[PDB]
């Protein structure tokens, strides 16, 4: 009984939303490039303890918690596959923004994001094969984008390195460019919220169901908690603990959306076509809640 | 593979891609090349 808006993909509002998302990504990267320098990146690359522990946490927890959640909640096969693909996806770039919100040594954050994406393009089909045994015996390994991952990584890294160079060359443009970028980020975020509300319409209520909401709410919170626990277990620095925990919970749901769209017809994946959106809003809300908790704890310290 | 989409780290719909001429939102998107989609008869099943 699931229905989609009559012209979902092809509409002026959706095109505007796509452009606004692109501008969000570019300006977020540009504004984030101010807080990192080459020397710290080199230092973190030379000492791979944090990088390795972050990869281990992400790629040994996210698919694992996805599979465990699906088995525990006795989800439908399509839903279990959807959350499994979401878990197998690399960490998104929203983790970098969240780490900036907790002043979390952004050099390690960007290094972890880049290495996580690069390791994803290799080992995501492997995790899909070794975790989808029992649901969808189909291959599902040629449906994962490969060249798109590399192009997206390069296109993300370009504005960040532009900002880093602009920093290292001449600080004087921080108070002339960062404030403007923050302003455009704010207006574009408001536009994104209203445009998603307009585009989705009332079809989201089909996605609303006690099982999908439960899994998509448990997944990012479990990711944050497990990342924090595992990073603190290895006697890592507190700033490193915070950034690792915040990165391991964030996910790139766009890959899951494209993979599910390619693998199956729209009628098979009808009600959970909005699952990436649910995961995105829930991870955003939980990140904001953690931001508020951290700032309240800081006030408690002072 | 058959997926030629440039994923956007901030994105929740299949048309959110970092591609200059936004064909994914046009009438004829061409980021996927799999016509042999699996109908998956046991999709709506629990184990």
């Amino acid at each position: 009984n699931f229905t989609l808006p009559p012209n979902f993909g092809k509409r002026p509002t959706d095109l505007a939303l796509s452009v606004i998302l692109v501008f969000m990504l570019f300006f977020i990267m540009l504004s984030l490039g101010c807080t990192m320098e080459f020397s710290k990146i080199k230092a973190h690359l030379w000492k791979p303890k944090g990088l390795a522990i972050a990869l281990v946490a992400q790629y040994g927890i996210m698919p694992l918690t996805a599979f465990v959640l699906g088995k525990v909640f006795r989800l439908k096969n399509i839903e279990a596959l959807a959350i499994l693909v979401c878990g197998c996806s690399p960490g998104g770039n929203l983790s970098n923004v969240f780490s900036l919100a907790m002043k979390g040594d952004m050099n390690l954050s960007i290094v972890m994001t880049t290495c996580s994406t690069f390791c994803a393009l290799g080992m995501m089909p492997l995790l899909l094969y070794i975790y989808s045994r029992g649901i969808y015996d189909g291959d599902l390994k040629d449906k994962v984008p490969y060249k798109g991952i590399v192009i997206s990584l390069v296109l993300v890294l370009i504005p960040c390195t532009i900002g880093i160079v602009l920093k290292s060359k001449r600080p004087q443009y921080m108070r002339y460019v960062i404030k403007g970028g923050m302003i455009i980020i704010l207006l574009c975020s408001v536009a994104v919220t209203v445009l998603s509300a307009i585009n989705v319409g009332k079809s989201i209520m089909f996605a609303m169901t006690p099982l999908l909401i439960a899994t998509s709410s448990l997944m990012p919170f479990i990711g944050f908690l497990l990342g924090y626990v595992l990073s603190a277990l290895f006697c890592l620095n507190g700033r490193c603990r915070r950034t690792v925990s915040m990165e391991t919970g964030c996910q790139n749901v766009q890959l899951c959306s494209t993979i599910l769209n390619v693998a199956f017809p729209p009628e098979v994946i009808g009600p959970l076509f909005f699952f990436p959106l649910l995961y995105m809003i829930f991870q955003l809300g939980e990140g904001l809640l953690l931001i508020a908790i951290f700032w309240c704890y800081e006030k408690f310290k002072t | 593979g058959t997926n030629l989409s440039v994923p956007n780290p901030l994105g929740f719909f299949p048309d959110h891609q970092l591609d200059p001429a936004f064909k994914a939102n046009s009438e004829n998107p061409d980021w996927d090349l799999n016509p042999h989609k699996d109908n998956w008869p046991d999709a709506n099943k629990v184990g």
């Epitope: 017809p265 | 058959t2 090349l33 016509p35 699996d38 109908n39």
Partner: antibody
């Protein structure tokens, strides 16, 4: 104008292989699927298999899986089918067809057809 | 595997007479069906795709309407230029079955 050109009529004794070509013109030929359809004069149509010339990805009908082989040869832009072992059953008219979206499986442009007769 | 069947195996109609042909699918295919028209001694040509939209360069008199398991192809005004077999096909499954034929012939 996109056009598909077939090789021509063939007459082959049973048990021997035969291959036919579908030269494509008027478009890139590298980013569009090609499907092969076999039609008997006294029966309906049936779908043999599909080939993507860009990457060589192919999908085959289960019935024709054993005795159909598809090749791209993107340099000359001529798709090929190999019939492998031949019997009197598979004497029909063979069509090469191209999709339009690469996402849906309705063919838009068809070749002139290749007639294959199997008999000793 | 999905089996496609066409109701009228043969059908005769004079020029300028409305006529419909019915297609039936074994399972639900969510209007993933396309109509082909083949003339005598010619390769088949795409006529209607997705069971509703008319292909490029086709006369406007053709019309198709259906979803699920029942499909139809009205011709409305009948012209001598179109007289031949008509075929169906689905994209839902992998085997892509083609269904049987439906021949249109002159009436006298």
């Amino acid at each position: 104008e996109v056009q598909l050109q077939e090789s021509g009529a063939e007459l082959v004794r049973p048990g021997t292989s035969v291959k036919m070509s579908c030269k494509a013109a008027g478009y890139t030929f590298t980013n569009y699927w090609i499907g092969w359809v076999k039609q008997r004069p006294g029966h309906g149509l049936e779908w043999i298999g599909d080939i993507y010339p860009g990457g060589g990805y192919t999908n085959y009908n289960e019935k024709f899986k054993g005795k159909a082989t598809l090749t791209a040869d993107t340099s000359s832009s001529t798709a090929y089918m190999q019939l492998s072992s031949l019997t009197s059953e598979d004497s029909a008219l063979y069509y090469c067809a191209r999709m339009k979206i690469n996402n849906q499986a309705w063919f838009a442009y068809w070749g002139q057809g290749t007639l294959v007769t199997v008999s000793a | 595997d999905i089996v496609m069947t066409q109701s009228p195996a043969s059908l005769s109609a004079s020029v300028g007479e409305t006529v419909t042909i019915t297609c039936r699918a074994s399972e639900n295919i969510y209007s993933y069906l396309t109509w082909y028209q083949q003339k005598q001694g010619k390769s088949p040509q795409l006529l209607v795709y997705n069971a509703k939209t008319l292909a490029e360069g086709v006369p406007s008199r053709f019309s198709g309407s259906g979803s699920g398991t029942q499909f139809s192809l009205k011709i409305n005004s009948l012209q001598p230029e179109d007289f031949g077999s008509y075929y169906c096909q689905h994209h839902y499954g992998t085997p892509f079955t083609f269904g049987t034929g439906t021949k249109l012939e002159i009436k006298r």
